[PDB]
């Protein structure tokens, strides 16, 4: 699925217009991105948590340190996917 | 930041009332969960991809079956935003 498919599902679920649904989807992921870029934790009860984690440089090949925007799924999501 | 903060961002960014914004945010994450539960990837350009990955099977000898788990792979825009 893609963003436009998500938008269509949101519209169908809420009966909001596709136009409002699209603005809402874009605002959600813009907001998560911005909070992560500010180095905040994003906790979404019933879904999971986004947080930037540091990955150390590794060592012929050398990988530099990185800041990885990472996701930890909640139990509700892990359960649904596994079943 | 948490779900309530995202809802505030949605209402601020969109035409939507606070109650409609909350419905919209919940519908977004319910939709993502519904796709992953079905085993379908969710690709969001300019944010990242939600995927379903294998958990390794492991080891009277006994085998714990391989499982499916949710995963997130940040996109280039998000990674650059964080770094």
């Amino acid at each position: 699925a893609n963003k436009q498919d998500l938008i269509a599902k949101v519209a169908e679920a809420t009966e909001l217009t596709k136009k409002d649904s699209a603005a809402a989807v874009d605002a959600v992921f813009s907001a998560v991105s911005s909070y992560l870029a500010k180095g905040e934790k994003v906790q979404l009860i019933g879904f999971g948590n986004f947080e930037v984690r540091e990955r150390a440089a590794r060592k012929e090949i050398k990988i530099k340190a990185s800041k990885v925007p990472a996701f930890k799924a909640g139990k509700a999501l892990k359960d649904a996917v596994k079943h």
Side-chain angles (χ1 to χ4, degrees), chain A residues 10 23 56:
Chain A
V10 172

Side-chain angles (χ1 to χ4, degrees), chain A residues 39-54 56-58 61 63 65-80:
Chain A
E40 278 190 64
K41 193 187 199 172
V42 181
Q43 297 186 256
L44 307 171
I45 288 298
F47 185 72
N49 295 341
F50 301 82
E51 198 170 15
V52 177
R53 87 190 175 76
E54 162 136 49
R58 303 156 38 212
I61 308 101
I63 313 94
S66 307
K67 300 302 213 196
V68 174
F71 179 60
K72 301 176 160 291
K75 172 70 168 341
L77 180 62
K78 292 173 165 301
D79 281 358

Side-chain angles (χ1 to χ4, degrees), chain A residues 7-8 10-39:
Chain A
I7 289 170
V10 172
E12 164 187 40
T14 67
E15 317 238 337
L16 297 173
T17 65
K18 282 213 179 52
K19 194 180 113 168
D20 288 331
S21 292
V25 167
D26 285 314
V28 163
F29 290 109
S30 297
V32 171
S33 298
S34 285
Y35 276 117
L36 293 173
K38 292 167 195 161

